[PDB]
Amino acid sequence: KTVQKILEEVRILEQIGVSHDAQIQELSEMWRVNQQFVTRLQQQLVDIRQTCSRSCQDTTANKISPITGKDCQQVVDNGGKDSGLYYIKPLKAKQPFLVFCEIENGNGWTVIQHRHDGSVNFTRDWVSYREGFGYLAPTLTTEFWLGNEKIHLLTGQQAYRLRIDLTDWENTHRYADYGHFKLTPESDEYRLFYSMYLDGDAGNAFDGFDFGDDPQDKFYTTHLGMLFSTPERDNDKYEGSCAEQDGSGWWMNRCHAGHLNGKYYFGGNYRKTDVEFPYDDGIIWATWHDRWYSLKMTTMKLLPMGRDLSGHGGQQQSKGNS
Amino acid sequence: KTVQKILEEVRILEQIGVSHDAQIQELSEMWRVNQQFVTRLQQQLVDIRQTCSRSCQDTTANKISPITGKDCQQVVDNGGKDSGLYYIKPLKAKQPFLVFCEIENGNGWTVIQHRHDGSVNFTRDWVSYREGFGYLAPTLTTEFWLGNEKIHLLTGQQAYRLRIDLTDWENTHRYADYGHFKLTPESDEYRLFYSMYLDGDAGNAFDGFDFGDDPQDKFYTTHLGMLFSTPERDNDKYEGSCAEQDGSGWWMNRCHAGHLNGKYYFGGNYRKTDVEFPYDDGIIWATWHDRWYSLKMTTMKLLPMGRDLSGHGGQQQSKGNS
Amino acid sequence: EVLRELERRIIHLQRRINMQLQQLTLLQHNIKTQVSQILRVEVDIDVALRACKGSCARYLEYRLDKEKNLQLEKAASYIANLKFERFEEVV
Amino acid sequence: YSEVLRELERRIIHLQRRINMQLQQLTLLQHNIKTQVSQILRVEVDIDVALRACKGSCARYLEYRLDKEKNLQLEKAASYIANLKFERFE
Amino acid sequence: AQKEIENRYKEVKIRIESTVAGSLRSMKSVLEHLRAKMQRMEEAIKTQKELCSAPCTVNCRVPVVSGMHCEDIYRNGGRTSEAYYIQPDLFSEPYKVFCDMESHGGGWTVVQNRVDGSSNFARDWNTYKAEFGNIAFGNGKSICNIPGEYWLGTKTVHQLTKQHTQQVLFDMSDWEGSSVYAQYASFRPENEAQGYRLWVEDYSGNAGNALLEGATQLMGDNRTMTIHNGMQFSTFDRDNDNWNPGDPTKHCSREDAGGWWYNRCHAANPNGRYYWGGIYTKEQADYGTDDGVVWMNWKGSWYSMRQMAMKLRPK
Amino acid sequence: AQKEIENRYKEVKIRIESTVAGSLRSMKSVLEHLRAKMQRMEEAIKTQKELCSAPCTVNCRVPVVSGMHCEDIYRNGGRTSEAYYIQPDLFSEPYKVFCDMESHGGGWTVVQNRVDGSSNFARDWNTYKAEFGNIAFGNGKSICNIPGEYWLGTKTVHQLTKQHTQQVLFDMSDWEGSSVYAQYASFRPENEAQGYRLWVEDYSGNAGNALLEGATQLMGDNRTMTIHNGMQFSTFDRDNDNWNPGDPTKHCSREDAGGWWYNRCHAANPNGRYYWGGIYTKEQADYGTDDGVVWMNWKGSWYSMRQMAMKLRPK
Amino acid sequence: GHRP
Amino acid sequence: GHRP
Amino acid sequence: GHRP
Amino acid sequence: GHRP
Numbered sequence A, B: 001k002t003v004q005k006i007l008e009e010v011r012i013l014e015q016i017g018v019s020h021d022a023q024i025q026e027l028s029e030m031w032r033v034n035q036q037f038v039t040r041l042q043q044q045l046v047d048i049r050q051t052c053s054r055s056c057q058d059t060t061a062n063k064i065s066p067i068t069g070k071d072c073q074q075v076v077d078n079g080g081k082d083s084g085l086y087y088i089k090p091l092k093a094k095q096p097f098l099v100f101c102e103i104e105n106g107n108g109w110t111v112i113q114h115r116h117d118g119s120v121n122f123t124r125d126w127v128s129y130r131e132g133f134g135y136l137a138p139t140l141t142t143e144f145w146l147g148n149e150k151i152h153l154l155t156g157q158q159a160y161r162l163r164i165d166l167t168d169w170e171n172t173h174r175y176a177d178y179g180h181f182k183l184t185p186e187s188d189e190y191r192l193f194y195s196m197y198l199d200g201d202a203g204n205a206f207d208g209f210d211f212g213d214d215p216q217d218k219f220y221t222t223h224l225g226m227l228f229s230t231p232e233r234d235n236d237k238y239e240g241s242c243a244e245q246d247g248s249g250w251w252m253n254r255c256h257a258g259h260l261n262g263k264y265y266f267g268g269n270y271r272k273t274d275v276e277f278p279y280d281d282g283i284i285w286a287t288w289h290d291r292w293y294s295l296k297m298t299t300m301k302l303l304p305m306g307r308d309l310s311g312h313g314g315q316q317q318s319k320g321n322s
Numbered sequence C: 001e002v003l004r005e006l007e008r009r010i011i012h013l014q015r016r017i018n019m020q021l022q023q024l025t026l027l028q029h030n031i032k033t034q035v036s037q038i039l040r041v042e043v044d045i046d047v048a049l050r051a052c053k054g055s056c057a058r059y060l061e062y063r064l065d066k067e068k069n070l071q072l073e074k075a076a077s078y079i080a081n082l083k084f085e086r087f088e089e090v091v
Numbered sequence D: 001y002s003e004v005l006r007e008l009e010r011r012i013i014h015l016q017r018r019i020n021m022q023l024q025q026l027t028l029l030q031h032n033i034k035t036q037v038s039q040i041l042r043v044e045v046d047i048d049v050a051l052r053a054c055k056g057s058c059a060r061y062l063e064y065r066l067d068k069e070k071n072l073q074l075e076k077a078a079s080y081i082a083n084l085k086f087e088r089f090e
Numbered sequence E, F: 001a002q003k004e005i006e007n008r009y010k011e012v013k014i015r016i017e018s019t020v021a022g023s024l025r026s027m028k029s030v031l032e033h034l035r036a037k038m039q040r041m042e043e044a045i046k047t048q049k050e051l052c053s054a055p056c057t058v059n060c061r062v063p064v065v066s067g068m069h070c071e072d073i074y075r076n077g078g079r080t081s082e083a084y085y086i087q088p089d090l091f092s093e094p095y096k097v098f099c100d101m102e103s104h105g106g107g108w109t110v111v112q113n114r115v116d117g118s119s120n121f122a123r124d125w126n127t128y129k130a131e132f133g134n135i136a137f138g139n140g141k142s143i144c145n146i147p148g149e150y151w152l153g154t155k156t157v158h159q160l161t162k163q164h165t166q167q168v169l170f171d172m173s174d175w176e177g178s179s180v181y182a183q184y185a186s187f188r189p190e191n192e193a194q195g196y197r198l199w200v201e202d203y204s205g206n207a208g209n210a211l212l213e214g215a216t217q218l219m220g221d222n223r224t225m226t227i228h229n230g231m232q233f234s235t236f237d238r239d240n241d242n243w244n245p246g247d248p249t250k251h252c253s254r255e256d257a258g259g260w261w262y263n264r265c266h267a268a269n270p271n272g273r274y275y276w277g278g279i280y281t282k283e284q285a286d287y288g289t290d291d292g293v294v295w296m297n298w299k300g301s302w303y304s305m306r307q308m309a310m311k312l313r314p315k
Numbered sequence G, H, I, J: 001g002h003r004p
């Protein structure tokens, strides 16, 4: 009986194998489609190795104009049209440098300083204030101080008009114009010099202010003729150090009436209470708001003292398109 | 013939006689003439008497408008057009009274106080401050205080906006607006009450000031809710007498932050040194200039709390007529 | 007849002079009544005129002065010798 | 019987034969999976590395990365099953 | 004879070369003077008339404080003497007036005032009723504290006294330097209808009760007929005195140059002619009468005061 | 006997259902899993490719302060580590670069840097000469202080050292958390003409003098032939190593995936393959060589650094 | 004064 | 001002 | 801005 | 690494 059972049993082990050869065949095909794919990838491997060899585009570098000149005005003359980054090169300038040009109505204002949000600490040293610090961008929305040497050499070439743009926290704007503004060389420190205050609706802060604390306030807060001073280099008219007390680089007299490089305070109104220097260290311009109101945005720009301008209208609003 | 040498003597005299006759005729002619001259003068007398009989013209009286109303606003409504002297009559007003109306852009501001040059001593008593003192003229160039009862009854009729015009010695102007400003009756003294500070570029002196002498300064210099006080009638929050020390009639708290009725000082900056009251008694508004800077010109005017307001533009130039 | 001529002659001259003493008298009177009246009109002109101070744009003050006119006048109305006269030959 | 059994004996060898071919086919498949695994593994690592290079190249960027790989445990068996090469004698 | 005719000769010669010739020289001299004098006056009035083309003006600032009478102001703080607006009636526009806040207690509303003969008082019934003159003058600082001459209207005064009985006070100063005063506890005049009859009570002072006693330096009728109490008001164009009613020849106002409360004329004659100097003869007056700022009881009939005022006050 | 047909059916029945049935069982899945694994990669490369249509961009603001080298900037006030423009030569336009102002003293101009395998270093002689890669990345505030991978041009480096001899400093960090450093007082390479030959002096540091000593864990030739000092630069398309000159089969640059100063290959191999994790077998490398960010002297031949940089400074 |  |  |  |  164990003989007749080897008939079907076996016959089964044979009918099964058929599948096994129908399966071993399957394993082959797949293995190929695979080896086919694996190869299709090796291919996709190079296209990728390559398309990813290129590096990012510097869109800022990309927007720095090739146009040049003594200043931003020459830059307009020689072509400049849109406000932005240009490389200018003043007279004794030993190495040309990057600056923001504010081009409007054929006017090429070369920008010197600009406060905007408070992202840059302005408590800096003498070299920092002379070599310059802060940042530059395709749009005047960054904070910087061009550098005292650059401002010296610049206001040295020819006569420049200095316009100071002030904006408070209600986004109200006001300016102040000083003609023949210029800085003496580092030898004389960096004395602030201007012929006089031309005009402006902000007030004449550079000519001191009657704060009301003492009859001598205006005389002691006038900046005309003052020497520059940083927190580690005192050149004021104070027994103490205005710059160190106020953590800034400005033309301190018996301190200040206008302090555009002061500490940034959001909201305008600010109090002392903190460390121990119960004195106004904000971004002020006393002829408009008072010592404990720091301006929201600020800008100091230069334009050749030999232009035209005169077309700011002013008065009521109407000022504002888009 | 001597007898005949005498006949010539008579003969000659006769001649003299006729000569004298002619003279007597000439004398009578003089008097004749004199006499008509006389009566001609007697006619010039009676005539001149007449021409010099009319009296001078009071050009001030002459410019006081017949138009009336609750206040200067009604005065505008009922006709008023030019700024000047008008007789207004508030509600419980028992006798109408003269006031200066500042009419501009259809607004009839009824003026309450005004410092201009320092010609009027403001160190006055309780009756003087309630009945009023100072002077009125066709132009707002005189100094006065309308009177507390008049201001009570006026700010009582309806709600009024209080505008305070401040000008410093560089002829810079700034204002401050308090809504629903009003004075309680004399029974409550003359408590200063306003809903709040609407707006203004001068500062909110009525809400006290952080003078910096002591953490409690702002609380002790706020005028809101304060009672009126004169040099002989103390109603302050001081152990001493602010009003007497400062020779004024104001809403003294632990003295003041805003002192529009203070002593006039030419030039703005002033020192104590003099008598013995080493305290600021000038015309101050601390939120702008400080305690030792007295303002040059000052004015407190009322306008119905139910009007437009904003007709002043601002920002820049082009704001000055005559 | 020549000597008794010079007489009537000398007498006629008199009544001729007396005629003058008559004119001189009236003049003396006229003068008196006139010296006053001019003063009176002046003191009057002084007063009324002073009322202009508070009536005209401009005022021009007028004060009096010398009354030596009352001394000259005094004489010229008390020198009444003019009253003098003669007569000669009547009855 | 001495011819039905003997004949049964043949259809027996028969399978044994088919078997040896099953194994012969499998031995080669076992070697080809030893290869594939090795390259796909490789090409994987080579592809992880090239994609990163894209981060400093393309605007937006993705990010591939390895995984578990209980795969290698499978190759051990999927391969080490040398049980394959077990031919039949006779 | 020879010396006979000779007689009348030598004599005639003198009366010519002296009594006639002389008289001419003198009389002629005088006549020239009078001529000149009249020339002065001729143009002295001439240029002045020219300047009077334009009237004078007062551009002085007006005091805030006011009241209803000068006393009310003093009560409210008006402590300096000057011009202010008062409003005695709620139904009558306020009017400027000079308040005396320094003489006798203060709170005095000036009703009449003489000081420099700067105004003419020979006005008619309507001028006197409505008020005429200058209340005050600019002191230069544009503050009107210099009193001018004037007479607030009689009507105004009347109304003031009808609302509340007043007390008057007269002040006067001679050209020498002295000065007396006279006051009456009560003052009040009837309406125009009654000719604004004068009624005053209780004298006091050092001037002389000229209103109730008249010129006390007179006898019988001479004194009584100079009493101003109870008399009506008169003007050159309205006789109400007590001097022969029907007779238009008897006009005290005509003879005494002012609008007053005449009674067979006067004892006190303010509002009269402003003679300058003090003394003035009976011959200088237009009608030979004692006209001009006269207050008999103190300086006789022939002395015109350098200053004269009439202030009113309730109490 | 019967137990003679069994061992002919006791095996066949077993192999059919054990070995055969099993291998089929197992294999299947393994083959399926692969097709799975590969299915991912394709949607990976293609998702990215789908995105690589547009290149990446960096829109960050440029720092005012500049100099002629990173040290000059530090001297002028550049005290933070980020990207700046420098201008070492007056006759050559300024170029962006990453300054390290915090590591060892500061004033370091980064010449090469690896940190996230974000760039490919298997470039040719010109790419290496001209500079390739991203100096830095936007930190979000538009300030580029995130260093990116790159290699300032060898030429640039050359010029910098020819103007003034530098001192290099190598920094590296493993994937565990540790980090060593290596510096040489002197650094300078000859011009392209010379194949930019490497010359460095005086080692110091805790990393291992791999440039002058080579892989000091070797003997005789094995060590010397891994010395980078004095060697020229090589790229996959330019063999200058010291590995059999004429033989094109001996290309260290080809086998070690990067442009370097190979000498019979290396001891220190920055610029290599950026393996992620640290360890990497000899079988994962494209040519069975120890490629990838290798610094033998510190982590052996089979450990690729997670970070690697090469800063330059004058003194 | 008085009158006749 | 204040009167501390 | 200034100092005491 | 070194090379064979």
Ligand SMILES: *[C@@H]1O[C@H](CO)[C@@H](O)[C@H](O)[C@H]1NC(C)=O
Pocket: A121, A122, A123, A124, A247
């Ligand atoms: C600003 O700088 C000063 C000094 O440099 C420092 O004390 C302060 O912490 C800084 N804070 C700001 C504004 O970031």
Ligand SMILES: *[C@@H]1O[C@H](CO)[C@@H](O)[C@H](O)[C@H]1NC(C)=O
Pocket: B121, B123
């Ligand atoms: C002002 O008047 C007051 C009160 O009479 C007096 O005390 C003060 O001294 C006077 N000063 C001036 C400037 O008039």
Ligand SMILES: *[C@@H]1O[C@H](CO)[C@@H](O)[C@H](O)[C@H]1NC(C)=O
Pocket: E218, E219, E220, E221, E222
């Ligand atoms: C009144 O005056 C006349 C004339 O001046 C005088 O004669 C008379 O005596 C006086 N009256 C008296 C009181 O007798």
Ligand SMILES: *[C@@H]1O[C@H](CO)[C@@H](O)[C@H](O)[C@H]1NC(C)=O
Pocket: F218, F219, F220, F221, F222
């Ligand atoms: C170099 O490497 C070879 C092969 O790895 C080794 O046999 C030899 O011993 C090494 N060289 C030295 C130092 O002997």
Ligand SMILES: [Ca+2]
Pocket: A234, A235, A236, A237, A238, A239, A240, A241, A242
């Ligand atoms: Ca100092």
Ligand SMILES: [Ca+2]
Pocket: B234, B235, B236, B237, B238, B239, B240, B241, B242
């Ligand atoms: Ca008290």
Ligand SMILES: [Ca+2]
Pocket: E239, E240, E241, E242, E243, E244, E245, E246, E247, E250, E251, E252
């Ligand atoms: Ca009569």
Ligand SMILES: [Ca+2]
Pocket: F239, F240, F241, F242, F243, F244, F245, F246, F247, F250, F251, F252
């Ligand atoms: Ca080679």
